[PDB]
Structures are given as C-alpha cells and as structure tokens.
C-alpha cells in the first residue's frame, strides 16, 4: 500500500486523466506517480512523464540571440504558485507546457484550492495545491478523448478527498 495505490484507485480509475503525481511544495519535485498503461508492457515509463533531472536547453529570442538555460522542473511548478507567472514555461518530464491560467481559492464543494492549468499540443496538465504541503499534478491527453474540464474536475475531486482526510 502506497501513494501509487491511492492515486490509482481514487484518480486514475476515473479514466479522466492520463497520469497523476504528487510533489512536495518544498521543491516541486514529483515523489509519487501513476500513469495509464499496461504495466507491463516492458517499456512503460511513467516516470518519464513526471520527472527529469536538470537539463540545459538552448533558446533563441526574436533578435536571433541564442542562450542556454538550465531547467529545474520543480522550480517551474513553484514559480507559478509563488509568483503567478512562468518565466520559461512549465516543464515536466522534459516537456514544455504553456501556463494558461491560475485560480486562487477556487471553490469546489466546500473546499478551496489554488489551481493552475497548462497546455501543450493536444493535452495539458493541472496543478492543484493540496493538503499537507503537497501539489497534485494531473495530465490529460486529448488524443484519448480526455479533456481539460473533465480532468480538472477529476483533480478537484481527488483534492477534496485528500482534504477530507
């Protein structure tokens, strides 16, 4: 019995999300995760969706100036909650997401949550600050007929469940 069991039974089971993880608000790094897939399938790699140790990317600005940036993925989650913007976007598992929206103290059936949403090609993610100094990360994949709104409700339901514990 672990966080995996809990994430799987309470959230992955909804079929509304392609993956879900929990990160500490201390560093924004995912410490537990689950993903849709046929474990095992020798070859599913849930962690590649949720984690990548620091890496440099090359960036070119509109002046054609090329620089190199070190991405710390955890910091890109924290910056959105801490500052209300993402200077470099939100990066998770080596994938860049566009920061689309944040709501603070969004009310969901008697419980209030800070919720951020980010988008990528045919999918996206939600970040929800949840009890016990944690951040929930939920992924959705529009190729799977999951959607932005339904995945958010799934995440919110799970968060409420946590709050209720």
């Amino acid at each position: 019995y672990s966080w995996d069991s809990y994430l799987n039974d309470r959230l992955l089971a909804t079929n509304q999300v392609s993956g879900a993880g929990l990160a500490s608000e201390e560093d924004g790094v995912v410490y537990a995760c689950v993903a849709q897939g046929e474990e095992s399938d020798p070859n599913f790699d849930k962690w590649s969706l949720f984690y990548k140790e620091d890496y440099d990317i090359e960036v070119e600005d509109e002046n054609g100036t090329k620089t190199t940036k070190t991405i710390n993925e955890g910091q890109t989650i924290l910056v959105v909650f801490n500052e209300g913007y993402a200077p470099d976007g939100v990066w998770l598992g080596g994938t860049k997401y566009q920061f689309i929206n944040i709501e603070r103290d969004l009310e969901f059936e008697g419980y209030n949550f800070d919720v951020a949403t980010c988008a990528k090609l045919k999918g996206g993610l939600h970040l929800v600050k949840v009890p016990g100094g944690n951040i929930l990360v939920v992924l959705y994949d529009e190729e799977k007929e999951q959607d932005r709104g339904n995945s958010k409700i799934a995440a919110l339901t799970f968060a409420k469940e946590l709050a209720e514990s």
């Binding site: 966080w3 069991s5 809990y6 929990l22 410490y31 944690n134």
Partner: peptide, 8 residues
C-alpha cells in the same frame, strides 16, 4: 521525506 498515503 514524502508523507504517508491516507488510509484507504
């Protein structure tokens, strides 16, 4: 250290 999962 991660927290313990909630009871089922």
């Amino acid at each position: 250290p991660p927290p313990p999962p909630p009871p089922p």
